[PDB]
């Protein structure tokens, strides 16, 4: 699906492979890795793949294709590097400006429940427990989530 | 024929800054007309409309 | 902002005993210094909502 275009230093590939083995749930079939949950590691590898993008980087896999069948990541490694180098992401000030309009008082914060709702429903599909653990701690007494600090913590960590 | 939609410079800035957040930097100057003009000129539309 | 407030300029809108901001640049300065809204501040000064 993707051609070999750019390769980084092999030690970076080596540590990516090490993390994959960490996530490798196949004891004897360690050569093959999860087809669909590799995008979850790509999420964990300092990248932020959107749902549609993390789907068609895999050529529109099916749910059975996503989970049942296996795949060799090293074929996808050039495409993972391509996704990393696309830089199809906004900036921190861009993020805070975008989430600023989602307010009705301009206090520098956003109410928690509507933030969870838009994160789960308005945007890409995400389980709720994920959103409460995302703003776990970021949640305050009156619900006015500090969206600037929250988003800087997110993109930084 | 005329111009039906009329929007204030500050309202336009605070509303449509998401289009080009790079223009009108966050709290780095004080000007309305210039910021709005930069924002519109960065919107790649028919500039004779407004 | 205190010394900028002295630069406010207001003129009769349509000789109807109503104040309108003759100049807005210093109003923009005052609004930014407190982080206020220039349009809202000018509306409040020109029209108090008692």
Swiss-Prot record, chain A:
One of its GO terms (biological process) is regulation of striated muscle contraction. The N-terminus is blocked. N-terminus is methylated by METTL11A/NTM1. Keywords: Cardiomyopathy, Disease variant, Methylation, Motor protein, Muscle protein, Myosin, Phosphoprotein, Repeat. Disulfide bonds: none annotated. Residues 11-48, 90-125, 125-157 form the EF-hand domain. Signal peptide: none annotated. GO terms for molecular function: actin monomer binding; calcium ion binding; cytoskeletal motor activity; myosin II heavy chain binding; structural constituent of muscle. One of its GO terms (cellular component) is myosin II complex. Regulatory light chain of myosin. Does not bind calcium. It is linked to Cardiomyopathy, familial hypertrophic, 8: A hereditary heart disorder characterized by ventricular hypertrophy, which is usually asymmetric and often involves the interventricular septum. The symptoms include dyspnea, syncope, collapse, palpitations, and chest pain. They can be readily provoked by exercise. The disorder has inter- and intrafamilial variability ranging from benign to malignant forms with high risk of cardiac failure and sudden cardiac death. Rarely, patients present a variant of familial hypertrophic cardiomyopathy, characterized by mid-left ventricular chamber thickening. This is Myosin light chain 3. The chain holds residues 39 to 195 of 195 of the full protein.
Swiss-Prot record, chain C:
The cardiac alpha isoform is a 'fast' ATPase myosin, while the beta isoform is a 'slow' ATPase. The modification Phosphothreonine is found at residue 24. Belongs to the TRAFAC class myosin-kinesin ATPase superfamily. Myosin family. The rodlike tail sequence is highly repetitive, showing cycles of a 28-residue repeat pattern composed of 4 heptapeptides, characteristic for alpha-helical coiled coils. The gene is MYH7. It is found in: Cytoplasm, Myofibril; Cytoplasm, Myofibril, Sarcomere. Muscle myosin is a hexameric protein that consists of 2 heavy chain subunits (MHC), 2 alkali light chain subunits (MLC) and 2 regulatory light chain subunits (MLC-2). Interacts with ECPAS. Interacts (via C-terminus) with LRRC39. The chain holds residues 355 to 404 of 1935 of the full protein. It comes from the Eukaryota. Myosins are actin-based motor molecules with ATPase activity essential for muscle contraction. Forms regular bipolar thick filaments that, together with actin thin filaments, constitute the fundamental contractile unit of skeletal and cardiac muscle. It is linked to Cardiomyopathy, familial hypertrophic, 1: A hereditary heart disorder characterized by ventricular hypertrophy, which is usually asymmetric and often involves the interventricular septum. The symptoms include dyspnea, syncope, collapse, palpitations, and chest pain. They can be readily provoked by exercise. The disorder has inter- and intrafamilial variability ranging from benign to malignant forms with high risk of cardiac failure and sudden cardiac death. Congenital myopathy 7A, myosin storage, autosomal dominant: A skeletal muscle disorder characterized by prominent axial and proximal weakening, spinal stiffness, severe scoliosis, with or without respiratory and cardiac involvement. The age at symptom onset can range from early childhood to late adulthood, and disease severity ranges from asymptomatic to severe muscular weakness and respiratory insufficiency. Histopathological examination shows variable findings including subsarcolemmal hyaline bodies in type 1 fibers. This is Myosin-7.
